[PDB]
Amino acid sequence: MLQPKRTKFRKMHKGRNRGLAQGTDVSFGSFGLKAVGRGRLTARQIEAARRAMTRAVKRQGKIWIRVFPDKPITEKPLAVRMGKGKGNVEYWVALIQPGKVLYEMDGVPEELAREAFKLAAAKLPIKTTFVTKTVM
Amino acid sequence: MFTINAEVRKEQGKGASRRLRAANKFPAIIYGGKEAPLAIELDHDKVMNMQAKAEFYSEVLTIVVDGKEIKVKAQDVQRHPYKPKLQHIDFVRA
Amino acid sequence: MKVRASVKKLCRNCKIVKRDGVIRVICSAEPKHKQRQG
Amino acid sequence: AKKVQAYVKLQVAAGMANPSPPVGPALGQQGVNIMEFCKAFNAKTDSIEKGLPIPVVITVYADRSFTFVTKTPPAAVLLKKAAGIKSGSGKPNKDKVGKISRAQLQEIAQTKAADMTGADIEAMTRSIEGTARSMGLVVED
RNA sequence: AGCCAGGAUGUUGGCUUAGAAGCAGCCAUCAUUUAAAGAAAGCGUAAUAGCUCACUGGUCGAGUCGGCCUGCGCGGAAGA
């Protein structure tokens, strides 16, 4: 599980998730798993999907996780009233918008990249698509 | 070797461009050299199947606008974020 | 048979048929591949 | 031979007679005789040289048991008789386990012409060196 | 797409081969007469074997195959 090594403040406000994404082209690799839905992704979903990919295209290839969590999500325990402070940091999410290339892959044929990205897009909560490295 | 039939955009801004992409076209511009920049509207499907080739971004294109021919080169393409379609293309004269 | 909400062709003899508005997977090779309700 | 009518191919190294541990009733399930691997088969084995299994066609007729003629020496123990260690291949091609001189394969390939596919010497030369590709046997050029 | 034909040899390739002789195993994964063929893609064995196919010929006489972008729909869908 991914999590920043050392923050600056422990608890972040909710804020909103509007507009489109910045990481949009397949930059590092050759094939990409790009988001279409909005959503947000916990570190467990990123790890689950990465294991599905790494298993699927065996220890050949090279995989880039282009998103990183760095946003702490706090929850209140059970049978605790409202108020009395902000909750506790339970997990860490990345906020996703439509357009984020969530993962990249290189060093495989396209048909294995289809296969691993299908296998791993079923571990994520957002609708997802397959993209290739377009040249300009 | 590509011939891209175009028209001149009499309207511009975000209203007119988004109206122009719902009608299965997209805006574009031809700047460079000493002339004024030329706002251009392009059919979408022809240019999308055309840019699926690699030679679209390397070879000199020819754009036919008002019965002229402007030999341009595809400088920079804005693509739609999560759909296989185009927002806009910058064409530098050549 | 298997009532699932994803019905798929598990084999190359499996065959998707819609009967009475219900998607089904009829196989001839293996009857374990018989499925319903996709 | 004919349509498949009770002929199979099975035994182990035929320096001895009638292998009881390895196969046994595998040569007794069909109409193939138990006795005709013991005396007469070794009578037809001593005609060239012993110490080789024989995958053979045994067409069981309405005669006593059958009639048999051994035809070809197979290339498994012919490519194991001088190859390297006596244990086996395992993973033979990713390293250098065996090596075979190609002149003796040219003369054995020049001998064997019944149970092969080829009409030229060079056409069937590197086929048996394809069996050298099988057990990882590095040919010495 | 149907229908009529062919689809092998070293190849028991050695296996920890107790039986794997393409079939509970791993490395290999070659080369040829040949239009064409995998040391076997599916089943299958006490065990070879048994078939079909991957590919090619004939019959057939006009479309067919699979992706993409989409509109509307189907299933997923159980409560007093």
Domain ranges of chain B: 1-94
**Tell me, what CATH number does D62's domain have?**
3.30.1550.10
| Shared domain check, D58 and D77 | no
Residues contacting residue D15 through CB under 8 Å, at least 6 positions apart: D50, D51
Straight-line distance from the first to the last Cα atom of chain A, in angstroms, rounded to the nearest whole number: 34
D24 and D81 part of one domain: no
Using the Cα atoms of residue B29, residue B34, residue B36 and residue B38 in order, give the sign of their dihedral.
Answer: negative
| Contact, C19 CB vs strand E, < 7 Å | no
**Claim to verify: residue D19 and residue D49 sit in the same structural domain:** yes
Q: How was this structure determined?
A: cryo-EM
Asked if D66 contacts D58 with a C-beta cutoff of 8 angstroms, the reply is yes
Chains B and A are touching, with contact defined as 3 or more CB–CB pairs separated by less than 8 Å: yes
Q: Residue type at A91?
A: Y
Tokens of D94: 């990713």
Provide the 8-state DSSP code for C18: E
**Residues pairing with A91 in the sheet:** A73
Give yes or no for a contact between C25 and C8, defined as CB atoms under 8 angstroms apart: yes
Q: Report resolution in angstroms.
A: 4.5
Are the CB atoms for B77 and B89 separated by under 8 Å? yes
Number of domains into which chain D is organized: 2
D67 and D88 share one domain: no
**Residue D60: which residues within 8 A CB-CB, separation 6 or more?**
D5, D6, D7, D30, D31, D32, D66
Interface of A with B (CB under 8 A): 20-21, 24, 34-36, 98-99, 129, 134-136
Q: Distance, angstroms, CA D110 to C1' E34?
A: 22
β-pairing, C22-26 vs C35-36, is antiparallel
What type of residue is A29? G
In this structure, the number of other CB atoms found within 10 A of the CB of residue D59 comes to 16
Return d(Cα B77, Cα B29) in angstroms, integer.
11
From residue A27, give the alpha-carbon distance in Å to each of A43, A50, A85, B54.
Answer: 22, 18, 42, 17
Classify residue B67 as left (phi > 0), alpha (psi -120 to 50) or beta.
Answer: left
Q: Indicate if D45 and D58 belong to the same structural domain.
A: yes
Superfamily of domain B1-94: Ribosomal Protein L25; Chain P (2.40.240.10)
Q: Are residues D135 and D82 in the same domain?
A: yes
In angstroms and rounded to an integer, the radius of gyration of the C-alpha atoms of chain A is: 17
Residues D93 and D45 in one domain: no
Q: What is the domain extent for residue D92?
A: 72-140
Contacts of D26 (CB under 8 A, 6+ apart): D8, D10
D109 touches strand E (CB under 7 A): no
SS3 content of chain D, % helix, strand, coil (to 5): 25, 5, 70
**Strand E lies under 7 A from the Cβ of residue D2:** no
Residues D76 and D132 in one domain: yes
Are D54 and D15 in a shared domain?
yes
* CATH assignment of the domain containing D124: 1.10.10.250
- Residue D57 shares a structural domain with residue D82: no
Nucleotide nearest to D24 (CA to C1'): E19
Q: Specify the nucleotide whose C1' lies closest to residue D136 (CA).
A: E28
Distance CA D74, CA D57 (A): 13
Q: How many CB atoms lie within 10 A of CB B52?
A: 10
Q: Are residues D112 and D79 in the same domain?
A: yes
Same domain membership, residue D134 and residue D114? yes
DSSP state of B80: P
Nearest CA in chain B to A32: B82
> Which residues lie closer than 8 Å to A7 by C-beta, 6 or more apart?
A72
Written as one string, the DSSP assignment of A55-102 is HHT-SSSEEEE------EEEE--TT--S-SS--EEEEEEEE--TT-EE
